[PDB]
Enzyme design. Structure first.
Site, PDB file in Angstrom:
ATOM      1  N   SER B 126       0.823  -1.191   0.000  1.00  0.00           N
ATOM      2  CA  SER B 126       0.000   0.000   0.000  1.00  0.00           C
ATOM      3  C   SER B 126       0.866   1.254   0.000  1.00  0.00           C
ATOM      4  O   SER B 126       1.906   1.277   0.644  1.00  0.00           O
ATOM      5  CB  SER B 126      -0.900   0.017   1.224  1.00  0.00           C
ATOM      6  N   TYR B 150      -2.250   0.092  10.346  1.00  0.00           N
ATOM      7  CA  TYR B 150      -2.435  -0.503   9.025  1.00  0.00           C
ATOM      8  C   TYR B 150      -1.167  -0.331   8.183  1.00  0.00           C
ATOM      9  O   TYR B 150      -0.601  -1.320   7.721  1.00  0.00           O
ATOM     10  CB  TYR B 150      -3.692   0.051   8.317  1.00  0.00           C
ATOM     11  N   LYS B 154       1.719  -3.131   6.666  1.00  0.00           N
ATOM     12  CA  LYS B 154       2.176  -3.282   5.293  1.00  0.00           C
ATOM     13  C   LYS B 154       3.696  -3.130   5.213  1.00  0.00           C
ATOM     14  O   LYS B 154       4.355  -3.934   4.548  1.00  0.00           O
ATOM     15  CB  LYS B 154       1.444  -2.327   4.320  1.00  0.00           C
TER      16      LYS B 154
HETATM   17  N1  LIG Z   1      -7.631   1.057  -1.283  1.00  0.00           N
HETATM   18  C1  LIG Z   1      -7.568  -0.233  -1.090  1.00  0.00           C
HETATM   19  O1  LIG Z   1      -8.590  -0.936  -1.168  1.00  0.00           O
HETATM   20  C2  LIG Z   1      -6.227  -0.842  -0.804  1.00  0.00           C
HETATM   21  C3  LIG Z   1      -5.087  -0.067  -0.930  1.00  0.00           C
HETATM   22  C4  LIG Z   1      -3.842  -0.637  -0.744  1.00  0.00           C
HETATM   23  C5  LIG Z   1      -3.723  -1.949  -0.369  1.00  0.00           C
HETATM   24  N2  LIG Z   1      -4.840  -2.722  -0.223  1.00  0.00           N
HETATM   25  C6  LIG Z   1      -4.692  -4.096   0.244  1.00  0.00           C
HETATM   26  O2  LIG Z   1      -5.154  -4.954  -0.747  1.00  0.00           O
HETATM   27  C7  LIG Z   1      -5.703  -6.143  -0.121  1.00  0.00           C
HETATM   28  C8  LIG Z   1      -7.125  -6.339  -0.582  1.00  0.00           C
HETATM   29  O3  LIG Z   1      -7.855  -5.079  -0.463  1.00  0.00           O
HETATM   30  P1  LIG Z   1      -9.424  -5.074  -0.789  1.00  0.00           P
HETATM   31  O4  LIG Z   1      -9.786  -3.673  -1.126  1.00  0.00           O
HETATM   32  O5  LIG Z   1      -9.671  -6.126  -1.816  1.00  0.00           O
HETATM   33  O6  LIG Z   1      -9.992  -5.504   0.662  1.00  0.00           O
HETATM   34  P2  LIG Z   1     -11.102  -6.610   0.994  1.00  0.00           P
HETATM   35  O7  LIG Z   1     -11.435  -6.530   2.455  1.00  0.00           O
HETATM   36  O8  LIG Z   1     -12.208  -6.513  -0.010  1.00  0.00           O
HETATM   37  O9  LIG Z   1     -10.274  -7.931   0.640  1.00  0.00           O
HETATM   38  C9  LIG Z   1      -9.568  -8.552   1.718  1.00  0.00           C
HETATM   39  C10 LIG Z   1     -10.091  -9.947   1.845  1.00  0.00           C
HETATM   40  O10 LIG Z   1      -9.285 -10.627   2.835  1.00  0.00           O
HETATM   41  C11 LIG Z   1     -10.132 -11.417   3.590  1.00  0.00           C
HETATM   42  N3  LIG Z   1      -9.414 -11.684   4.813  1.00  0.00           N
HETATM   43  C12 LIG Z   1      -9.132 -10.785   5.800  1.00  0.00           C
HETATM   44  N4  LIG Z   1      -8.443 -11.307   6.781  1.00  0.00           N
HETATM   45  C13 LIG Z   1      -8.287 -12.639   6.433  1.00  0.00           C
HETATM   46  C14 LIG Z   1      -7.667 -13.717   7.074  1.00  0.00           C
HETATM   47  N5  LIG Z   1      -7.055 -13.627   8.257  1.00  0.00           N
HETATM   48  N6  LIG Z   1      -7.661 -14.906   6.412  1.00  0.00           N
HETATM   49  C15 LIG Z   1      -8.263 -14.997   5.224  1.00  0.00           C
HETATM   50  N7  LIG Z   1      -8.880 -14.049   4.536  1.00  0.00           N
HETATM   51  C16 LIG Z   1      -8.861 -12.880   5.201  1.00  0.00           C
HETATM   52  C17 LIG Z   1     -11.405 -10.589   3.742  1.00  0.00           C
HETATM   53  O11 LIG Z   1     -12.514 -11.355   4.175  1.00  0.00           O
HETATM   54  C18 LIG Z   1     -11.546 -10.059   2.311  1.00  0.00           C
HETATM   55  O12 LIG Z   1     -12.304 -10.928   1.471  1.00  0.00           O
HETATM   56  C19 LIG Z   1      -5.546  -5.943   1.391  1.00  0.00           C
HETATM   57  O13 LIG Z   1      -4.371  -6.565   1.894  1.00  0.00           O
HETATM   58  C20 LIG Z   1      -5.518  -4.425   1.484  1.00  0.00           C
HETATM   59  O14 LIG Z   1      -4.854  -4.084   2.666  1.00  0.00           O
HETATM   60  C21 LIG Z   1      -6.092  -2.193  -0.469  1.00  0.00           C
END
Ligand SMILES: NC(=O)c1ccc[n+]([C@@H]2O[C@H](COP(=O)([O-])OP(=O)(O)OC[C@H]3O[C@@H](n4cnc5c(N)ncnc54)[C@H](O)[C@@H]3O)[C@@H](O)[C@H]2O)c1
Ligand SMILES: NC(=O)c1ccc[n+]([C@@H]2O[C@H](COP(=O)([O-])OP(=O)(O)OC[C@H]3O[C@@H](n4cnc5c(N)ncnc54)[C@H](O)[C@@H]3O)[C@@H](O)[C@H]2O)c1
Ligand SMILES: O=c1ccn([C@@H]2O[C@H](COP(=O)(O)OP(=O)(O)O)[C@@H](O)[C@H]2O)c(=O)[nH]1
Ligand SMILES: O=c1ccn([C@@H]2O[C@H](COP(=O)(O)OP(=O)(O)O)[C@@H](O)[C@H]2O)c(=O)[nH]1
Lengths: 341, 335
Positions: B126, B150, B154
């Site tokens: 991120s 958070y 990361k």
């Molecule tokens: N703006 C953003 O959305 C953004 C920005 C930068 C990084 N990210 C990272 O990208 C990844 C996905 O983001 P997203 O927007 O798709 O979020 P999201 O919450 O839609 O996807 C994350 C998924 O991980 C699952 N999950 C969480 N903890 C878990 C665990 N312990 N075991 C198994 N599954 C688990 C959740 O149920 C969910 O389906 C994350 O790591 C997030 O931190 C997102």
């Protein structure tokens, strides 16, 4: 009246010595250790050394990552505070086995912190390290100074400190003291307890002790091209017993209301090279340490020693033992316990 | 053959679809903390004949026995690790939760990977690892320092990955620093469907737009920006997804870091207005203080990715908001 303290990693080197000071200081202490780098023998001997204060020591063989075992400990005793020594600490091993280190150190810490929070014990004294100062730009190293890490072990200490800072920001009820240890050496002056690592030691002075009594063939010196007086690395060596006493000073300090999440160096403030330490050990022991000269250990700092001012002023604590005492007590322990407990 | 952690989630789902359309097989593990099975039921259907190459399981990465069973049944060529909690503001209030879930889950995942000889990884990092940037655009080599739990998870995970690679050169790892993905599959058949109260800006907007929340709270109006609101690099999620297919190809020739953004800064109010243009809906706003842990201006340098992954974002804000609205209007209560 008699305050109750849980000591993770309390069967280890620093922990065992500190547990004894706790007991002699009037504290009850519950130890939790998984014997990864220690044995039962240490606390058996602490118990005896503590005399009638031995009654106030309990011990359980528990991994901190074992949430159910740990919750059990916290459900049954109301802890006034936790001292958190449990972890892996060999840099060299850490570079080779990073996940083991992240797993054991961070998972075990997070689990402990959650369990502490659940059972309403939010007073923590954490075993941090001068490694978090990284390659210092300026010595002595003050609590205000820049922090960084240079290997996986150091990162675990740095990351945990950061976690404790976030926990504190999240929840004002937490009182946390992050003690940055320099390089504890020596043994209780009775010589009945001391450092006894499992397998191959990674710290300098236990490795030296083990060469001296004939169990390792040589000390490898990591770096002879440092810009020091003899070319070897300079560090701040503190007597383990002074370091133990610092924990008693930290526990008293948790009663201050101003305390939220505070850092104290526990060092002597004097820098000693590797070859000076070896020389001092040779003096104390009458033994020769065969030296193999090698390169720098990846991540090592050149010169690191403590500013002691803040700990003196705020904890009312200063190290009382010099190098000669450190080596005297180490040798007293090792001569009679050449292969540990 | 790819293991996708958090594959039922927003970015995961879209990426799993691209994997299936691009000829890959995918196993998804997810603990449904911020998603449901339903999203994968729809990807499967949308993926057509390729759908039968998708398999999915309710598994927490912290549940080591459950995760070992997964690895014991399929040989994975690579893992894509999306699983985690991702709300800056939640994390400030609940640090242990973030450290527990994000670090313990990742560490467990990496150990199992190594245990089962799958040492190829793409990781969801991120832009928060840039903390509060002193210069923009943010380059891969610019300073890394988080301002909230958070971001630290990361940053910490990146560092653990580097250390892992250093300990064992069989590992091939790519750390993708996502900026701010937004939008939906242009079909409108899949999109962002968070469970619980939404944390991210655009799923909160889309839910205000369809009656599910009363207002959007704007977090800070005194920032040193054109309109006083925080500026981000919003990137179409389909662009992000395609970036992961490119990352998988890149793994076939290291612990490398790549920004995935557009390189353009857009404020919170500009995003709202773009959404109102696309949707025809009026979003009630409450103006509030800064959200703990938020950067002021964050956007991506796109050079390294362009040069090394042959990848650039092609969708603009206008396409992001249309696709978002297209999903929202047809699935107002999501799945
Ligand atoms: N703006 C953003 O959305 C953004 C920005 C930068 C990084 N990210 C990272 O990208 C990844 C996905 O983001 P997203 O927007 O798709 O979020 P999201 O919450 O839609 O996807 C994350 C998924 O991980 C699952 N999950 C969480 N903890 C878990 C665990 N312990 N075991 C198994 N599954 C688990 C959740 O149920 C969910 O389906 C994350 O790591 C997030 O931190 C997102
Ligand atoms: N020795 C030093 O020079 C030095 C310097 C700075 C910081 N420290 C820190 O001080 C602490 C104690 O150091 P030490 O010299 O006493 O080391 P040690 O290895 O003797 O003590 C650590 C103890 O923790 C136990 N342990 C480890 N992981 C555990 C787990 N998951 N659950 C339960 N018990 C566990 C070990 O068995 C051992 O008894 C460590 O955290 C170390 O990082 C040591
Ligand atoms: O077998 C060894 C162990 C340590 N050292 C050096 O001795 C000092 C103290 O090492 P230790 O690992 O005990 O302490 P650290 O400084 O890592 O906390 C450092 O400069 C090490 O490079 C050494 O030369 N040989
Ligand atoms: O209800 C919300 C959610 C987000 N934001 C702001 O919109 C931007 C996008 O935040 P988001 O949580 O989507 O992602 P982050 O930038 O924290 O990864 C940031 O400036 C947030 O402060 C906001 O004002 N209100």
């Amino acid at each position: 009246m008699a305050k109750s303290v849980l000591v993770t990693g309390g069967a280890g080197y620093i922990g065992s010595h500190t547990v004894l000071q706790l007991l002699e200081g009037g504290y009850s202490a519950v130890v939790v250790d998984n014997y990864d780098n220690s044995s039962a023998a240490s606390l058996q001997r602490v118990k005896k050394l503590a005399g009638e204060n031995g009654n106030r020591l309990s011990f359980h063989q528990v991994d901190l990552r074992d949430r159910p075992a740990l919750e059990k400990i916290f459900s049954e005793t109301k802890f006034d505070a936790v001292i958190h020594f449990a972890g892996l600490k060999a840099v060299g091993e850490s570079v080779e086995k990073p996940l083991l280190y992240y797993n054991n150190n961070i998972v075990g810490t997070v689990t402990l912190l959650e369990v502490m929070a659940q059972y309403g014990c939010k007073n923590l004294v954490f075993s941090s390290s001068a490694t978090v100062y990284g390659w210092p730009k300026e010595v002595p190293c003050t609590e205000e100074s820049p922090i960084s890490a240079t290997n996986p072990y150091g990162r675990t200490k740095l990351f945990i400190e950061e976690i404790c800072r976030d926990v504190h920001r999240s929840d004002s009820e937490w009182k946390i003291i992050l003690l940055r240890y320099f390089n504890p050496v020596g043994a209780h002056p009775s010589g009945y307890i001391g450092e006894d690592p499992l397998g191959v030691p990674n710290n300098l002075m236990p490795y030296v002790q083990q060469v001296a009594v004939g169990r390792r063939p040589h000390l490898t010196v990591f770096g002879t091209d440092y810009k020091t007086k003899d070319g070897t690395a300079v560090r701040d060596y503190i007597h383990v017993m002074d370091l133990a006493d610092g924990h008693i000073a930290a526990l008293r300090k948790l009663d201050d209301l101003k305390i939220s999440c505070e850092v104290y160096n526990l060092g002597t403030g004097n820098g000693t090279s590797v070859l000076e330490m070896v020389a001092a050990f040779e003096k104390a022991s009458g033994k020769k340490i065969p030296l193999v000269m090698a390169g720098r250990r990846p991540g090592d700092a050149e010169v690191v020693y403590a500013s002691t001012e803040k700990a003196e002023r705020e904890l009312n604590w200063k190290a009382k033992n010099g190098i000669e005492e450190m080596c005297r007590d180490l040798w007293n322990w090792a001569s009679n316990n050449p292969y540990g407990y």
